[PDB]
Write an enzyme that holds these catalytic residues in place. Structure first.
Site, short mmCIF file in Angstrom:
data_model
loop_
_atom_site.label_atom_id
_atom_site.label_comp_id
_atom_site.label_asym_id
_atom_site.label_seq_id
_atom_site.Cartn_x
_atom_site.Cartn_y
_atom_site.Cartn_z
N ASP A 450 0.81 -1.12 -0.12
CA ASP A 450 -0.15 0.08 0.04
C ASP A 450 0.87 1.16 0.02
OD1 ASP A 450 -1.82 2.12 0.68
OD2 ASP A 450 -3.00 0.97 1.66
N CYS A 580 -22.51 21.46 -22.23
CA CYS A 580 -23.52 22.58 -22.83
C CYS A 580 -24.13 22.89 -21.32
CB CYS A 580 -24.25 22.45 -23.61
SG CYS A 580 -24.85 20.62 -23.93
N1 LIG Z 1 -3.31 0.81 -7.08
C1 LIG Z 1 -3.19 0.51 -5.74
N2 LIG Z 1 -2.21 -0.20 -5.46
C2 LIG Z 1 -1.97 -0.24 -3.91
N3 LIG Z 1 -3.10 -0.03 -3.03
C3 LIG Z 1 -4.01 0.83 -3.66
C4 LIG Z 1 -4.21 1.02 -4.99
N4 LIG Z 1 -5.36 1.81 -5.03
C5 LIG Z 1 -5.69 1.87 -3.79
N5 LIG Z 1 -4.96 1.58 -2.77
C6 LIG Z 1 -4.97 1.48 -1.35
O1 LIG Z 1 -6.32 0.98 -1.16
C7 LIG Z 1 -6.65 1.29 0.17
C8 LIG Z 1 -8.07 1.98 0.20
O2 LIG Z 1 -8.63 1.87 1.33
P1 LIG Z 1 -9.65 3.00 1.77
O3 LIG Z 1 -10.68 3.53 0.73
O4 LIG Z 1 -10.63 2.87 2.85
O5 LIG Z 1 -8.58 4.33 1.98
P2 LIG Z 1 -8.42 5.80 1.50
O6 LIG Z 1 -8.64 5.63 0.00
O7 LIG Z 1 -7.23 6.25 2.12
O8 LIG Z 1 -9.34 6.55 2.59
P3 LIG Z 1 -10.82 7.37 1.96
O9 LIG Z 1 -11.53 6.90 0.85
O10 LIG Z 1 -11.85 7.13 3.14
O11 LIG Z 1 -10.39 8.77 2.05
C9 LIG Z 1 -5.82 2.67 0.63
O12 LIG Z 1 -4.90 2.23 1.31
C10 LIG Z 1 -5.24 2.81 -0.87
O13 LIG Z 1 -3.84 3.31 -0.64
#
Ligand SMILES: Nc1ncnc2c1ncn2[C@@H]1O[C@H](COP(=O)(O)OP(=O)(O)OP(=O)(O)O)[C@@H](O)[C@H]1O
Ligand SMILES: [Mg+2]
Ligand SMILES: [Mg+2]
Lengths: 985, 147
Positions: A450, A580
């Protein structure tokens, strides 16, 4: 006084009034095992006034099967005493206490009472009191792969909201004299029979604008009826209707009354005869425990099973239950009596916490009243489950060994999983894996990736993080926390800060993916989901997808060579408004918010980028003069932001903000009304400003008005930030500066060779040379919704509300503006817990290697209405190629790195197919219609060399394969689909 | 995605569009450069208009981005080339081919829609002073759409 910096995502699900009422409620929780601790954690994260715990039983080793606030150093201490300290850290606004003894009258101190791990006699004693004193009572139970919930909120429960949906609203076209209300062209009201609506802005029938709700009689997807409006008028034109939601009264029965005649909630309609069985089975469990000093039947013991079945027969006879007892299912309930699974605990704890929130807030429709659930399809069948294998071993996995056995424990301990994302679902999944003992063996391993960092709003549903962790990486913190929970995971977890995508294939390559056992997605966007799905399809790895949205959630399982992939299904796309509509003719606040966001980007972001690029790229002007769609715009932006309108102080920023106010809220509206006067008509004779088009009116700057001052302050502050000046907030300076402002005259213009290039050149040479400005840069404004001190949401709100005032649209507050502009997804901790439980219940099926497609279950649920549903996965489609059965999704061709001609000859001679198109990535490697010279130049080249030549980029050293898409025609000329090609480099 | 795009390209190749000619840029299948010929019964007669088409990664589940490159004096086409076409913003469905889009754009060039315009000044000129609109359109299509 709600801390919107912490409950940002939860307020979009519940609301301000719901949370205000929730923060004045006390919750008592009896029992502090896995289910109890899950419920308490969810309640503490929700934000109730306080939580009290009651569990004087000393800790034992098996209790660690699903209790993650207990360590092996706490054996022999009461569970509540050792759990209160760790629960007190989850939320600082929710005190957590402990009571050594419970008295009946004491129960009057609490808004809700949750009961777990309590005998039926004590439950009856507690409910006999809580029912007549109007105290919400919830009783939960978890036995192996079986679970039960019982809710009793009193005889006169009042539910304000029964589905959690926003009130329906729409625009009317005409209302007849008989109340037949019709929507605009191709517009569906969505109402149902019996609903109530209120009308406003109705022309020709003012009487309906009072606001009195009226019944709805749906006559079709586009029209409905409200009754007789004869007296009020003959016909009404245009207007907007809004649904009105009325409270409902729900009457619950006591536990004693409902034991005889229960009312069931069915989590699945394929097995509707089971809940009557579980009703007898759980009572028999209680009776057996009472008859054996509180000892449940031993795991997989036949004598105890027979005695339990005799108890079931006695109970069924006593209650006059005219139901034939299913011996197999009842004895299965007997066998798994001592089971304690973290997945079942998470699922039931999420559900029960949602029920507690319903009790406290009087919102959403509660369970009425018995909810019996089972996941018996998860029981392993490839291992030996007997009395010898399921007996306890004196370890922390006894609660799970009592259900699955030691051999399945060994299978779990050698898993090699890959978790993508570390959000709320990621944290829950990591907790479940730690409790289950995943990857605690010699050959086990966990990898979590992450690239995001911890923020304040994430702590409301990501319980593995603390306020001291804000600003740090999610994966490292999650790995450390889970290693703390289960010390055996020390060195078995690897954390990456890499985004999963095309740019990270050097880390998550063939070697990394060949050692995995399964992949679990915890993402929040569809792009990464699709990418991971494609990678799993290529490498043939099981995938576990899960998603949540407010109180809704779903979980899907992808099994190689069995089911279809994640990308085989389509979901509704995002709604983008016509250009538009946004540019000139808005009619909803969303249009104005989108316009304000575009204005922000065009005022504080794009011109700064152009100026910075001009001062860096030596040949930017020449490239822009023939590349961009408006070189004159770029030159004007550069000139204005460098020389013409460069502020020297903050007063000039205030003057610029005033000028922009005039530009965007007073002059463009005058031009629009000059082009299309309010009395103009269309080509068909109808008035132009009718229906979806609202006639605007220019705004005159009034300093005393709040919205005007807010816009001026935000724009001046953002301009100063762009130029790095010292902004101010005292109204005195603004009022002093804006007093001496003379608006330049403006009159709408009616309009009425190659010299333009000469003017562009003259403007270009008037700009200062880049060499004269070295080290000078302008700071662009990058949109950030979560910060309340950068004036981004303030500016967007002010601009949107001013444009709404232009078009007589109802302005929204900063809360809704932040929700809309930021694309915030509502989120809840209970939904996360439920989806984690379902995913972990499917994980054991994946580990066991189940082959039949009927044994897997994709799950969907909506907690606002208490709806749960499970359906079998869709099988992968088959196809006929060269008289052979081919899987459309999970089959591929494996070929060496041969030449293009050799590939074509192989496909001609082996499959009897003529290749007409061959592509790799986003490039067309070969097409049947290309000129012969190009093919003759490309035919004798190898696939790797051909790809390198066409894509103009050498293959990376870590690249070991190529995925090719091929379209070919049969001998007769009929197009036939074929699986992709896997060229081995 | 790739297979659908190539099927559309082959269909265009098999049956010539006569009034249109679309093809990939270089060798990229997600970026096409199309050509439209001005209708004879329109002010844009004898004109060649170049359009850029960007297929999204989710094609055909998301609309392609079609933008004019040649300057045109049309009430529904602005200076950036954006086209006010309903089938490209919210009416898009995975059942419309590029030939249909080009035919729709040609029909739009045949007769504008000033009642729901994108350029209010051009629409005002079109509704009020038709002859001046015709002269301006001819001047623009002679200055930009020729040579
Ligand atoms: N392509 C990706 N590769 C790795 N991690 C990802 C990717 N896209 C999203 N994430 C991670 O997936 C997790 C999604 O969890 P969550 O949506 O609850 O958290 P957030 O987006 O940080 O919070 P919020 O949407 O509530 O503002 C986040 O840690 C985001 O960093
Ligand atoms: Mg984040
Ligand atoms: Mg997110």
């Amino acid at each position: 006084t709600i801390d919107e910096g912490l409950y940002s995502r939860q307020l979009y699900v519940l609301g301000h009034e719901a949370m205000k009422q929730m923060s004045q409620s006390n919750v008592l929780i009896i029992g502090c095992k896995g289910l109890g601790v899950e419920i308490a954690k969810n309640v503490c994260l929700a934000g109730v006034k306080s939580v009290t715990l009651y569990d004087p039983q000393p800790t034992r080793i098996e209790d660690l099967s699903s209790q993650y606030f207990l360590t092996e150093d706490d054996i022999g201490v009461p569970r509540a005493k050792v759990t209160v300290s760790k629960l007190a850290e989850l939320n600082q606004y929710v005190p957590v206490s402990v009571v050594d003894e419970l008295s009946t009258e004491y129960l009057k101190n609490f808004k809700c009472v949750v009961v777990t791990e309590t005998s039926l006699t004590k439950q009856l004693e507690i409910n006999d009191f809580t029912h007549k004193n109007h105290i919400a009572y919830i009783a939960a139970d978890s036995r192996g792969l079986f679970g039960s919930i019982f809710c009793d909120f009193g005889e006169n429960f009042i539910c304000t909201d029964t589905d959690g949906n926003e009130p329906l609203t729409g625009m009317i076209a005409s209302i007849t004299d008989d109340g037949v209300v019709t929507m605009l062209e191709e517009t569906r009201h969505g109402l149902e029979n019996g609903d109530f609506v209120k009308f406003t802005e109705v022309k020709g029938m003012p009487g309906l604008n009072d606001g009195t709700p009226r019944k709805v009689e749906v006559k079709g997807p586009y029209t409905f009826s409200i009754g007789s409006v004869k007296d009020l008028g003959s016909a009404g034109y245009n207007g907007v209707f809004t649904q009105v939601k009325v409270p409902t009264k729900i009457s619950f029965k006591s536990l004693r009354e409902s034991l005889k005649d229960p009312e069931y909630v069915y989590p699945d309609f394929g097995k509707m005869m089971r809940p009557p069985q579980y009703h007898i089975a759980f009572q028999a469990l209680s009776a057996f425990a009472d008859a054996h000093e509180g000892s449940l039947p031993r795991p997989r013991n036949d004598i105890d099973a027979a005695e339990f079945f005799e108890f079931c027969k006695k109970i069924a006879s006593t209650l006059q239950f005219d139901v034939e007892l299913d011996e197999k299912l009842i004895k299965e309930i007997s066998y798994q009596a001592r089971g304690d699974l973290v997945a079942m605990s998470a699922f039931l704890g999420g559900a029960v916490a949602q029920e507690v929130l319903k009790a406290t807030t009087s919102k959403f429709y509660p369970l009425k009243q018995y909810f019996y659930f089972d996941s018996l399809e998860s029981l392993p069948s490839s291992v030996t489950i007997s009395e010898e294998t399921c007996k306890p071993r004196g370890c922390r996995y006894d609660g799970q060994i009592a259900v699955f056995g030691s051999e399945f424990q060994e299978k779990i301990a050698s898993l090699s999983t890959f978790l993508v994302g570390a959000g709320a679902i990621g944290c829950e999944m990591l907790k479940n894996w730690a409790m289950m003992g995943v990857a605690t063996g010699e050959s086990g391993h966990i990898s979590v990736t992450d690239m995001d960092s911890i923020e304040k709003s994430n702590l409301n549903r990501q319980f593995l993080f603390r306020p001291r962790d804000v600003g740090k990486l999610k994966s490292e913190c999650a790995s450390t926390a889970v290693s703390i929970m289960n010390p055996s995971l020390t060195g078995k977890i690897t954390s990456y800060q890499e985004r999963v995508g095309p740019e990270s294939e050097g880390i998550f390559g063939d070697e990394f993916f060949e050692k995995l056992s399964l992949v679990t997605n915890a993402l929040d966007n569809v792009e990464a989901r699709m990418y991971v799905d494609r990678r799993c399809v290529f490498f043939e790895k099981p995938l576990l997808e899960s998603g949540t949205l407010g109180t809704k959630g779903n979980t899907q399982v992808v099994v190689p060579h069995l089911t279809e992939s994640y990308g085989s299904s389509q979901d509704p796309p995002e709604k983008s408004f016509p250009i538009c509509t946004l540019k000139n003719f808005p009619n909803r606040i969303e249009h104005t918010i989108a316009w304000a966001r575009d204005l922000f980007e065009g005022l504080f972001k794009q011109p700064i980028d152009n100026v910075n690029m001009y001062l860096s790229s030596p040949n930017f002007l020449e490239t822009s003069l023939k590349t961009s769609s408006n070189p004159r715009e770029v030159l004007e932006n550069i000139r204005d932001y460098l020389v013409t309108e460069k502020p020297l102080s903050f007063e000039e920023c205030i003057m610029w903000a005033r000028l922009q106010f005039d530009k965007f809220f007073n002059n463009n509206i005058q031009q629009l009304l000059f082009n299309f006067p309010k009395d103009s008509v269309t080509s068909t004779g109808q008035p132009f400003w009718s229906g979806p088009k609202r006639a605007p009116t220019p705004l005159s700057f009034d300093i005393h008005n709040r919205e005007h001052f807010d816009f001026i302050v935000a724009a001046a502050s953002l301009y100063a930030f762009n130029y790095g000046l010292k902004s101010e907030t005292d109204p005195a300076i603004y009022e002093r500066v804006l007093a001496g402002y003379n608006p330049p005259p403006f009159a709408p213009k009616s309009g009425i060779a190659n010299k333009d290039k000469q003017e562009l050149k003259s403007i270009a040479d008037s700009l200062p040379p880049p060499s004269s400005l070295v080290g000078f840069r302008l700071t662009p404004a990058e949109f950030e919704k979560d910060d309340d001190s950068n004036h981004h949401i303030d500016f967007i709100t002010a601009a949107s509300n001013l444009r709404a005032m232009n078009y007589d649209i109802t302005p929204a507050d900063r809360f809704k503006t932040k929700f809309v502009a930021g694309k915030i997804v509502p989120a809840m901790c209970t939904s996360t817990a439920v989806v984690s439980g379902l995913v972990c219940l499917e994980l054991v099926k994946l580990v066991d290697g189940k082959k039949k497609i009927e044994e897997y279950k994709n799950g969907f649920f909506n907690l606002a209405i208490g709806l749960f549903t499970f359906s079998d996965p869709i099988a992968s489609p088959k196809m006929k190629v060269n008289g052979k059965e081919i899987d459309k999704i999970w089959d591929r061709y494996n070929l060496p790195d041969c030449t293009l001609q050799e590939l074509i000859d192989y496909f001609q001679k082996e499959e009897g197919l003529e290749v007409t198109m061959l592509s790799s990535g986003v490039s067309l490697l070969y097409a049947n219609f290309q000129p012969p010279k190009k093919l003759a130049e490309r035919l004798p080249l190898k696939i790797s060399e051909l790809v390198e030549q066409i894509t103009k980029k050498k293959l990376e050293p870590f690249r070991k394969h190529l995925v090719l898409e091929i379209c070919c025609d049969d001998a007769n000329g009929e197009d036939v689909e074929v699986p992709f090609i896997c060229i081995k480099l | 995605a790739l297979k659908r795009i190539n099927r559309e390209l082959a269909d265009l190749g098999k049956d010539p569009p006569s009034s249109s000619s679309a093809g990939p840029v270089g060798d990229d299948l997600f970026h096409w450069q199309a050509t439209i010929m001005g209708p004879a019964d329109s002010p844009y007669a004898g004109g060649v208009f170049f359009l850029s088409i960007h297929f999204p990664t989710d094609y055909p589940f998301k609309p392609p981005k079609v933008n004019f490159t040649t300057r045109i004096y049309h009430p529904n086409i602005n200076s950036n080339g954006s086209i006010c076409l309903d089938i490209l913003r919210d009416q898009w469905s995975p059942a419309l081919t590029i030939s249909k889009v080009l035919l729709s754009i040609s029909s739009l060039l045949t007769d504008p829609n000033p009642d729901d315009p994108l350029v209010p000044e051009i629409a005002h000129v079109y509704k009020t002073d038709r002859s001046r609109y015709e002269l301006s359109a001819r001047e623009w299509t002679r200055k930009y759409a020729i040579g």
